[PDB]
Design an enzyme around this catalytic site. Sequence first.
Site, PDB file in Angstrom:
ATOM      1  N   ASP A  92      -6.815  13.056  -4.948  1.00 38.99           N
ATOM      2  CA  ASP A  92      -6.046  12.009  -4.521  1.00 38.99           C
ATOM      3  C   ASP A  92      -6.610  11.461  -3.078  1.00 38.99           C
ATOM      4  O   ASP A  92      -5.827  10.724  -2.517  1.00 38.99           O
ATOM      5  CB  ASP A  92      -4.616  12.391  -4.405  1.00 38.99           C
ATOM      6  N   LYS A 100      -3.984  11.740  13.712  1.00 43.58           N
ATOM      7  CA  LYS A 100      -3.062  11.846  12.522  1.00 43.58           C
ATOM      8  C   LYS A 100      -2.083  12.748  12.570  1.00 43.58           C
ATOM      9  O   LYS A 100      -2.421  14.067  12.876  1.00 43.58           O
ATOM     10  CB  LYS A 100      -3.807  11.656  11.264  1.00 43.58           C
TER      11      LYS A 100
END
Lengths: 315, 315
Positions: free
Chosen positions: B234, B106
């Site tokens: 989150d 990522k």
Amino acid sequence: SDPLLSVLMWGVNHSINELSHVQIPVMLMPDDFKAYSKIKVDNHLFNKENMPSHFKFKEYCPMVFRNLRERFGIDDQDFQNSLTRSAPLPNDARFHTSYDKRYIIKTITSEDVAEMHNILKKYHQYIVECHGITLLPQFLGMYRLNVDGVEIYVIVTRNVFSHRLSVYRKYDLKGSTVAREASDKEKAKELPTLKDNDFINEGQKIYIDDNNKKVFLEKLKKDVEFLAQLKLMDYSLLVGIHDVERAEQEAPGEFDPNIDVYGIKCHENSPRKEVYFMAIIDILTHYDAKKKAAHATVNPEQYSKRFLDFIGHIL
Amino acid sequence: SDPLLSVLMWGVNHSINELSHVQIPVMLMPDDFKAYSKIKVDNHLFNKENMPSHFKFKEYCPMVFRNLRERFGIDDQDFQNSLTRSAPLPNDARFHTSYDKRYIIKTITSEDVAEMHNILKKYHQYIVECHGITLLPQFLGMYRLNVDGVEIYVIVTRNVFSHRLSVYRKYDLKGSTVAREASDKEKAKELPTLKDNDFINEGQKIYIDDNNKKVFLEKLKKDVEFLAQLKLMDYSLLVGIHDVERAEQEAPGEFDPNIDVYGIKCHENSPRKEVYFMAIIDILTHYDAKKKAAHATVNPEQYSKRFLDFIGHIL
């Protein structure tokens, strides 16, 4: 032990690994003679036990030297192993020997590097012409090493001497008009390096047959002509003698001519079983130190003939 | 193809080779969390076909991630092969998958890197405590890549999904008070990413037995508590469903729990033969873009409970 030596091993390992991925063409382009590979490593609080923590490694013209190694019958994996599997050993510019005695690592000046770049193309072309059959140094790689403060340049050549067979006597011949003799200090070194007079005075003979002698002298003629053409001088013929008897007292006395390429067996009527190792060494000018000799008459063509005359006589 | 990807492969290869020479102790020292390895390469007129000619590769805390990989049961040779034997494949921040589907690469912000450094010690300690049995991302390496002008940061994690078994349905669950639904645009993607409402509305059930469920929820409880403690929020529960029947129509449907560590088999009375893959993903803050959402009410502890309540209900 020596960090500069660690960087050299690391660098040679890196360099060869990189090249194993590159597609190797049969030819070199003009740019390959201007090329280089630069690596700068910075380790912060990491890997202190193996390597210096800040260093640089530069490889000059990696393709040209890759091409030369193959032409000299040297495989890149073997070359890598010889230089990385264990540390090179010194012997007291400085020089080192690969642990397996196949290669010599010599420390040179930035001036020598500049001159090597200058003759590299012409040298490569000569090697092509003679199909890698020459008494010239076999140049195998050239590098710059930096370890925090200190910068050194090294060049790697094939050992003139054998990797199996020990040398008991060693000569360095120029054929100069001025007297060349090893010092009374030198003549007493462990394995001394004798010179022109030491050879004449002690009446040393080289017992090789007429064929070997003719071949050798022809090779020599071409090599020296080429060196004179590049306006190079002050090179030597390194002569090393292996005594099969003495090496038994301390293949029976035969060598692999593909590893020990400068070996020549003695002829049948030789007084003792001897193998000779002969090659031209030290071809660069190093004017920095020759100006140092000057500060505190012969030309390249003269030297060429003088040198060739002398070697013809002693064989 | 992509030069940044080439540099990553090159760098991961270099990094792992370097570490294979280092003696690995059982413990990390405080400095290992501050450490890095930097390589700058400059090739002039050399090796144009494989690599960019000017690049930088930086590895953060190489010992910590070496230590993490082993704790997560990952061998350095396998890790190296998975990332270097063939290029990672994209799928359109960007992310890539190792060619063998074992690892995710990522792209992250310098801010994410700063935050990762900040939590790295506490994260390592957590991994030690739970013996590497966690639903948290398995962080495996972190790097900076520079190719003439462009600088990117990447992190490498273990794939939540299987390297053999394809996933036909995919959920991303937060348990938020605000409505979460995939777009009518998204709900029509190739293999879509569904959200909270998609799960409630379509009445999806997860058919795992009471033991598996209890173990899972206990792991989850600890992991989420730890995340709340670091004031992180989150994050999501990624849920992927493999349909053994559908995968046959297009081990019989069994997996290696040592490669696909997030797999849980369905129980005996399950309507269809299903394997589940569930894990927490996306734990960092990325405030740069959350400030971008703000410019143009719940706290970490709230989020923690809200998230835990929701996952308890849906299983």
